[PDB]
Amino acid sequence: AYTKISDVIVPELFNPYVINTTTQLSAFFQSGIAATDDELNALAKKAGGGSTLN
Amino acid sequence: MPYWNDLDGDSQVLNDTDDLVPQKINAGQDKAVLILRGNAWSSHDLAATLSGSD
């Protein structure tokens, strides 16, 4: 009568992973803050570690 | 088909006399469906030769 799809075997499939980025897109740049001085530089790099000057 | 949701979490206070802890990743799932349709309809004959066209 019938070979009747019931009998034959049905495989499955996959495909490689893909990244998905959850996002609250967040900037609030550019604004304050930006555009640094060099005096805070003299508070940043070694030598003369912090805390901050006056 | 799968996916990897992006990392997130709070930072920690970098401080001596204490250490840090790692954090983790996940995976996710996706599906679809395969569908199929179709049909067939007849014609007549003698009515075609009687009625002036096919």
Resolution (A): 4.2
* Backbone torsions φ then ψ of B4, nearest 5 degrees: -115, 110
CB B7 within 8 A of CB B23: yes
* Beta bridge mates, A20: B5
Structural contact between residues B26 and B4, judged by C-beta atoms closer than 8 angstroms: yes
The end-to-end CA distance of chain B, in Å, is 50
| Inter-residue contact B2 to A17 (CB < 8 Å) | yes
Q: Which of A17, A23, A24, A25 to mutate to test the interface with B (most CBs of B within 10 A)?
A: A17
CB A20 within 8 A of CB B28: yes
Give the whole-angstrom CA distance, residue A18 versus residue A16.
7
Give the residues after which the backbone of chain B is interrupted, taking a C-to-next-N distance over 2.5 angstroms as a break.
none
- Per CB-CB distance under 8 Å, the chain A contacts of B27 are 17
**Dihedral pair phi/psi, residue A33, rounded to 5°:** -115, 155
Q: Is B3 exposed, middle or buried (0-12, 13-18, 19+ CB in 10 A)?
A: middle
Name the nearest CA neighbour of A14 among B39, B38, B2.
B2
Contact at CB, B5 and A17, closer than 8 angstroms: no
Q: Which method was it determined by?
A: cryo-EM
